[PDB]
Amino acid sequence: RGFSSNMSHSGSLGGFGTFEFTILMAALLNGGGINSNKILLHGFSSYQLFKGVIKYLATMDLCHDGHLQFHSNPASKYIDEGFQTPTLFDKSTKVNILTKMTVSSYQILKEYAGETLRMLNNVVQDQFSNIFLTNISRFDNLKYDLCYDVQLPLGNNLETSLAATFGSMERVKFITLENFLAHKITNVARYALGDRIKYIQIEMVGQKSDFPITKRKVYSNTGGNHFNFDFVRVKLIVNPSECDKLVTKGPAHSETMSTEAAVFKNFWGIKSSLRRFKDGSITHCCVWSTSSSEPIISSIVNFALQKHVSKKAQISNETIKKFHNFLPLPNLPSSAKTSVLNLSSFFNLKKSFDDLYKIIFQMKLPLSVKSILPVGSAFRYTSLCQPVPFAYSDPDFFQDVILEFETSPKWPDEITSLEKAKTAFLLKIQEELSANSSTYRSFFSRDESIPYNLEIVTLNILTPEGYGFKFRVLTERDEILYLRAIANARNELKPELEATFLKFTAKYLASVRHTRTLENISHSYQFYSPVVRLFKRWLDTHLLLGHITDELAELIAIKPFVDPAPYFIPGSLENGFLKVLKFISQWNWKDDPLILDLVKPESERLTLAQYKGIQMNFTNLRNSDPNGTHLQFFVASKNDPSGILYSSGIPLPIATRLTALAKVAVNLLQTHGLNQQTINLLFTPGLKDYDFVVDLRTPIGLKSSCGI
């Protein structure tokens, strides 16, 4: 977790080492409870001693409300009062060991203790490697959602104003200017962002601690014996729920301006305003404007930091800007101002579907309509480009919809007869739809996705709103006929027929379940929507989407969220995407299966019996396919217990290519830090290793009809 016993008021995450860990052992082995009762018993094993403290740090608060006192030379007692700073007092020695702990670092420490406690209590999955054998501190971007590097002015000494701000009063409180500026940056940044973030870390890049014997104090090349740092980096854990809130709520209005209102007006200055809302409340509030290139946080940190710390500072986070730009910008009104967390484009598509959803039911048919289930990509907030009215060059323009009529015994028992009855339904649906509702346009098309099943015909409905929907029948007899299909086939042909059945259930049966779960889970994971398109965009640039079914990319892209350990749930596009690339880089799909609990953050969680069943499937498959030539990625969940549904038919070269690019991408990030040049290098294709390359150009440009 990147925790050390070193100073943290300077800016580095740390202060908590063995000694603070081991000293806390003894305090709890001598008590620790609110009743001075022993929390740890001296007969405990190594596991039990470690568990209680990971539990202790997780739930008892030692900084704001509550503090612990012990006796080195007397049972340790947990006091409810707190000193507003991390404190483990020792009455025998009158020292607080937790003085080196910063307020900001303590909550980050408490978060790691709690989330490990959840894995420690976990029984379904083994968590030994994640808790101990995985370094989360290698990359700041992977560990932290947003990073802003601030270049202080005149950096062979800080400007007279900044040196003046430190002033005599703060040497006594804060011995070094590096310590003081970090506290200044934390307080203004914490206060400015407020609820928009969970945790904030301020780090002094290029701070040295060792100097030659010939010299009295450490010398920084920029410092000039004045300031031991090159620059500061503001690292954040953003809160997706309220990160993109347009307004920062403040204290309410009153006859006499309150102290909270006083600090509120002074801090934001002209940016502050008193504004009223529909509910009738009058409160002091400030305004921000959303952008498709940057989050609201970049605007707040820039304005807040310039006003208070230094007007000459330079705030820049270009890395996050590039990823936002790489996401396609739709051709809708006010697209640039729209935030990347807004799903309004998808919602307008659903409302248009709802209008057609009503027309179809009131229509009279020989069989009553059981249900209409939209299964298209845009319905699950995953389409690479957001839906655009009349932008029919988008390949995702026609959204799949499954129509199922009421069960009847009059279905043809011959599958080619079965579908020609299915098409006869859609034919009638087309006829009265054309008559009653002429504003809707429609046409039929053939589907050949199911191998050998050449009679499938689908109705493409062009809604007046400017959206396309594609309709196909589902029939209860259809499934068993395929089960009949495998049984009668010759033993040599049975493996081929089951493949036909596999893609049938992938499109008809399991497709419904995939959209239902993903749509619901996507609400909790606000940043799943943006990241999955950018991952699919990355696949397209390297020519991998053609062999990779869209579902497989989705199940891969959701792994960092349902299983974020040892990391936290991403709240940024750059953080979420790189985590997907990291997982692929370290994924051993030959020996390690990929299984997910598509559930909201803490039922439908995989318990032990269902869990063991899935590995048993993996071992049996790998027993027959040890090299993994036939199957490479084993992706399973509650929806897909077989684990081969969405990862079958991919050539081995594409599977290794997917992992090959990920490792080189991670190695690229290792050799050269995240920057503009690297990001372009990630998202551009080599096209050289391919044996032969063919260049095509379409007669007309397809961007404007694609909604980009």
Binding site: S45, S46, Y47, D126, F128, F132, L133
Partner: peptide, 25 residues
């Protein structure tokens, strides 16, 4: 639990310092 206990013991012996480098210091 037994799996976790053995995993601890394997982890320890990997990271135990070599006693020869102790005697050197």
């Amino acid at each position: 639990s037994n799996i976790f206990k053995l995993q601890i013991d394997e982890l320890l012996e990997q990271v135990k310092l070599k006693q020869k480098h102790v005697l050197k210091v």
